[PDB]
C-alpha cells in the first residue's frame, strides 16, 4: 500500500512445504507516489493481527560516503558551560577518509515539532575524515524564546550535518536526533522489579539504570536511600540487584533508589521511588513462599538454583511434600514439574538446567497447597521473571571462506562460509551500504524478533502479585481447583497499563557494468553433515562491480531450531585507481547537463597521468571532434581524486548509457564505468481526478443494477508520446 493507504497489491500465498520462507516480488510502477510505502501481511485464520514493514520510495542516487554525527556524550547537561560538542566523521564506503566541508545546524525537538537555531549554523572543514563543532550554551538560550535553563529539560536536541566533498560531486545529509537535555546523566527504572514483596523476606530490587536516550548503563553504583551499606553495581545488562530486608508487618514499602556516581554532584544523581505492596495471604494465615534466584545473567546451557523457602507454622508441617513449579516461556507452558520437599527442610534447592528454549526469558511460577491450616484449602504461590541472554536458538555465522588477506576486487570470485544448523534453509541478501546511508530504519534483526516476542507475552507483571490469584494472573496462568480456589477473570487481550598513443584502445577495457543496489537473493540449504551440530557450507559468489562495502545478511530457518538472523558480514571492495560516475537520477530531455567522472587514485607516493574518455553516444548531443570519442589527459595527485566534467544534451527518452573509460599512462591498469540514466521529457507528474461517483444499485439505475460509464481522461496539458496510468478505486461505504 501507498502513503495514501490504499492497497495497490493484494496477494494470496501459502507457506506449505516452503520451510516457512515465502519469497515474493513486486514491480514498482513509474507513475507512483513518493514516501513511506507499507507491506501488511496477515494470516488468513487471524485477519485482524497485521504484521507490517515499511520501505521508502524516493528518487535518489547512491551516495559515495557515510556521515556519522556523534556527540561527545549521548545527552546534554543543562549546566554544562562548554555547550554540546559534536564530531562529524565522514568516511568513504570503501573505507577511506573524506576531505570536505560540513554545514552543521542545531535545533530543539520539542515533542512532535522541531525548531531550528539559525545562528547555530556553522561551516567547518573536514580534514582526515573528521571535524569538530561546538554548539555554545548561550546560543541555545537566546535561540529559545522561553526564558531560563530549566524549561529546556525534557526537550531534545538534534543536529543536522550536510557534508560537501571537496570536488563537490557528492553530498550527504545526516541527522543525529534524540539528544535529550537532562539534569542527570542516568535514569532509574523499576520495570524488571516486582511490585509485590513478601513481608519478612528480602526484596530483590532489580533496578534498571539507563542512559537518557534509552541505552543501558554500565558500572553505575546505585543505592537505596537510608540504607547506605546496600551499594550495588550495574552489570552489563544495565540492571543491578539490591537485596534489602523487609520488616514483618503488612505495610507498603517505599523504596527510594539513587545513583552513587563519584564524579557527579548530588543534584546530578538520578532517583526514583517505588511503593511496593505486601503479598496478601488468605485469612492472614502468615503462610508465604519465597522464590530466591541468585541471578545476574544466564547463557543457555548453564544452570540456576531456585531456592524454595517455606514460611508457615509447624502445627501444619509435614503436610507439604512438594512444590509445583511451572516455566512460562513465550506465553505458553514450557516445562512443569514437582520438587520434592521432605519435612524438616525449610529451604530446598531445585537446579534448573537452562537449555536453549528458555530464550528470551521465563517465569518460574511455584505453588503449594495446604488443607488443615484453618479448616479450608489454601494455595500459596510465588513467581519470578528470570532473563536469559537473548541470542539465537541455533546459530548462524557468515564469514570469509577464503583467507581474506587480500582485498577483494570487482568481479572477483569470493568464497562465503556459512555456519549454521543442520538442514536449515539459509536465505541471503547483499546490499550496498549507501542504501543504509539514505535509509537506515526497518531492518530485520534478531533483537527485533525478540522484542516482537517480548511484546506478545501474556505475563504482565514480573515477579509476584497481590495474592495467589494475582501471582497466577500476572504470570499469565489460570489456576482452578475443585474446592473453589480459582484465578480471577481475565478478559482483555492486552496487559493493563499501570595526438596518437591510443592507450584506451590498446588496453581492451571491458566496462564495469553491473551496479545493483542489492543482490545475492539466494536460497541455500545446509545439507552437509554437522561437526558438533554446526553445518558449514562454502559458496562461490561473484562480486558485483560497485566499489563499496557490501553488507550481507543471512537468515537461517530451521525445523528444530527456528529463525536466526545472523550478524551482518561486510565485504569491502576497493581498487587503487578507479572511476566513480556521478550521474544524477533523471535528466529532463533537450536540456544541457553536466556530469562528473571522479577518478580516484589511492597510491601513497605516485601521481597518475590518466587518459580519460567519454564514449560517443548518439542519444546525447556533445562536441563533435574529428575523432568521434571525447578523450583528455588529467593528472591526479596521490591519495586524491579529480572530477572531470562532461556536458551533454540528451535527445531520446529512456534509459540511455554513459560510458567512461580511463587508462593510466606508464602503468598496466585501467578502469571503465558504464551506467544508465533516465531521460524524462520536460513535463511534470501531476494528477487529475476523472470522477468521484457514489454507487447505489437500489437507489440509482434500474432493475436492481446501476450502469456507470467511466469517460476517457480529459487531459489537455499532457505531454505527447508519454505514458499515463488511470487508477480505479472502489470502496465500500460503511453504514450504521
Amino acid at each position, epitope marked *: 500500500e501507498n502513503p495514501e493507504g490504499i492497497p495497490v497489491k493484494q496477494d494470496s500465498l501459502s507457506s506449505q512445504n516452503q520451510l516457512g520462507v515465502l519469497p515474493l516480488s513486486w514491480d514498482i510502477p513509474e507513475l507512483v507516489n513518493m514516501g513511506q510505502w507499507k507491506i501488511r501481511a496477515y494470516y488468513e485464520n487471524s485477519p485482524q493481527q497485521v504484521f507490517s514493514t515499511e520501505f521508502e520510495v524516493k528518487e535518489y542516487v547512491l551516495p559515495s560516503f557515510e556521515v556519522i554525527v556523534e556527540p561527545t556524550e549521548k545527552f546534554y547537561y543543562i549546566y554544562n558551560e562548554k555547550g554540546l560538542e559534536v564530531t562529524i566523521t565522514a568516511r568513504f564506503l570503501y573505507g577511506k577518509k573524506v576531505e570536505g566541508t560540513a554545514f552543521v545546524i542545531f535545533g530543539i525537538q520539542d515533542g512532535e515539532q522541531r525548531i531550528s537555531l539559525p545562528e547555530s549554523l556553522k561551516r567547518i572543514p573536514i580534514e582526515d575524515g573528521s571535524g569538530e563543532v561546538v554548539l555554545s550554551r548561550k546560543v541555545l538560550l537566546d535561540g529559545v524564546q522561553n526564558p531560563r535553563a530549566e524549561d529546556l529539560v525534557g526537550k531534545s536536541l538534534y543536529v543536522s550535518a550536510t557534508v560537501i566533498l571537496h570536488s563537490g560531486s557528492d553530498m550527504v545529509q545526516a541527522e543525529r536526533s534524540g539528544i535529550p537535555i537532562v539534569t542527570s546523566p542516568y535514569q532509574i527504572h523499576f520495570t524488571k522489579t516486582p511490585k509485590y514483596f513478601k513481608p519478612g523476606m528480602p526484596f530483590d530490587l532489580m533496578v534498571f539504570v539507563t542512559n537518557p536516550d534509552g541505552s543501558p548503563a554500565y558500572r553505575v553504583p546505585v543505592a537505596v536511600q537510608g540504607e547506605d551499606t546496600v551499594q550495588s553495581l550495574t552489570q552489563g545488562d544495565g540492571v543491578a540487584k539490591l537485596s534489602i530486608n523487609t520488616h514483618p508487618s503488612q505495610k507498603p514499602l517505599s523504596i527510594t533508589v539513587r545513583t552513587k556516581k563519584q564524579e557527579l554532584s548530588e543534584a546530578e544523581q538520578a532517583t526514583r521511588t517505588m511503593q511496593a505492596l505486601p503479598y496478601s495471604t488468605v485469612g492472614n494465615s502468615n503462610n508465604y513462599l519465597h522464590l530466591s534466584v541468585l541471578r545476574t545473567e544466564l547463557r543457555p546451557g548453564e544452570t540456576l538454583n531456585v531456592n524454595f523457602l517455606l514460611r508457615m507454622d509447624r502445627a501444619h508441617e509435614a503436610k507439604i511434600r512438594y512444590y509445583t513449579y511451572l516455566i512460562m516461556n513465550k506465553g505458553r507452558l514450557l516445562k512443569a514439574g514437582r520438587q520434592v520437599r521432605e519435612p524438616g527442610q525449610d529451604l530446598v534447592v531445585l537446579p534448573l538446567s537452562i537449555t536453549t528454549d528458555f530464550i528470551p526469558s521465563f517465569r518460574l511460577v511455584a505453588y503449594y497447597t495446604l488443607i488443615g491450616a484453618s479448616g479450608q484449602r489454601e494455595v500459596v504461590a510465588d513467581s519470578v521473571w528470570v532473563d536469559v541472554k537473548d541470542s539465537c536458538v541455533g546459530s548462524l555465522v557468515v564469514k570469509s571462506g577464503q583467507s581474506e588477506d587480500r582485498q577483494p576486487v570487482p568481479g572477483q570470485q569470493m568464497t562465503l562460509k556459512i555456519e549454521g544448523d543442520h538442514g536449515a534453509r539459509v536465505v541471503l541478501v547483499a546490499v550496498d551500504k549507501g542504501v543504509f546511508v539514505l535509509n537506515k530504519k526497518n531492518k530485520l534483526t534478531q533483537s527485533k524478533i525478540w522484542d516482537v516476542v517480548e511484546k506478545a507475552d501474556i505475563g504482565c507483571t514480573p515477579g509476584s502479585g497481590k495474592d495467589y490469584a494475582g501471582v497466577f494472573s500476572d504470570a499469565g496462568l489460570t489456576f482452578t481447583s475443585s474446592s473453589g480456589q480459582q484465578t480471577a477473570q481475565r478478559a482483555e487481550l492486552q496487559c493493563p497499563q499501570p595526438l596518437d598513443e591510443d592507450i584506451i*584502445a590498446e588496453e581492451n577495457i571491458v566496462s564495469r557494468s553491473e551496479f545493483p543496489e542489492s543482490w545475492l537473493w539466494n536460497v541455500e540449504d545446509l545439507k552437509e553433515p554437522p561437526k558438533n551440530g554446526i553445518s558449514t557450507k562454502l559458496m562461490n559468489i561473484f562480486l558485483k562491480d560497485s566499489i563499496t562495502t557490501w553488507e550481507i545478511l543471512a537468515v537461517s530457518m530451521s525445523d528444530k531450531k527456528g529463525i536466526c538472523v545472523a550478524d551482518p558480514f561486510e565485504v569491502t571492495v576497493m581498487q587503487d585507481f578507479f572511476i566513480d560516475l556521478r550521474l544524477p537520477y533523471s535528466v529532463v530531455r533537450n536540456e544541457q547537463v553536466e556530469i562528473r567522472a571522479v577518478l580516484y587514485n589511492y597510491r601513497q607516493n605516485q601521481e597518475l597521468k590518466v587518459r580519460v574518455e567519454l564514449l560517443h553516444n548518439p542519444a546525447f548531443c556533445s562536441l563533435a571532434t574529428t575523432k568521434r570519442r571525447h578523450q583528455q589527459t588529467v593528472t591526479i595527485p596521490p591519495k586524491s581524486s579529480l572530477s572531470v566534467p562532461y556536458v551533454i544534451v540528451p535527445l531520446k527518452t529512456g534509459l540511455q548509457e554513459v560510458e567512461v573509460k580511463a587508462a593510466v599512462y606508464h602503468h*598496466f591498469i585501467s578502469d571503465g564505468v558504464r551506467k544508465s540514466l533516465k531521460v524524462v521529457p520536460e513535463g511534470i507528474r501531476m494528477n487529475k481526478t476523472v470522477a468521484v461517483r457514489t454507487l447505489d444499485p437500489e437507489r440509482l439505475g434500474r432493475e436492481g443494477v446501476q450502469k456507470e460509464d467511466i469517460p476517457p481522461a480529459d487531459l489537455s496539458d499532457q505531454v505527447p508520446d508519454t505514458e499515463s496510468e488511470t487508477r480505479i478505486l472502489l470502496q465500500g461505504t460503511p453504514v450504521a
Partner: nanobody
Amino acid sequence: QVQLVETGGGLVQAGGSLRLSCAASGSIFSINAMGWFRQAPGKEREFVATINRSGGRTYYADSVKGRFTISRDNGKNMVYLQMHSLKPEDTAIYYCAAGTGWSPQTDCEYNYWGQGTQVTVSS
C-alpha cells in the same frame, strides 16, 4: 596465488632464436602484468619484458628493444618470450613473474615468481 613454471632454456648459437613458455597453474585472467626478468651471472635481476592483461601494451628494456617479443595467450594461461638475433651478453637465468600492473618495469611489485631456465648463447 599461482604456481609458475618456465620451460624452454638451453644451448643457443650466436645470432639464433629462442622461444619459451611461462606456464601458470591458476587463472591468468585477473593478472594485470606478467614480465620476463633475466639474471646474468654476477649481476642483478633486471627487467627485460612485460605484457598487459589484454596483451595490447608491451614494455621492453633498452638493451633488448628490437630483438625481443613478449606475447600472452589467456586460453591456457601461457606467456611466451621470443628472441631473434642473440648477442652473447644474454646468457642469463630467465624467470617469469606475475604482478598487479603497478610500475611494470620494476621487480618490486611482481609478487609471484618462477624458478627460471638457464639460457646460454655461445659465441
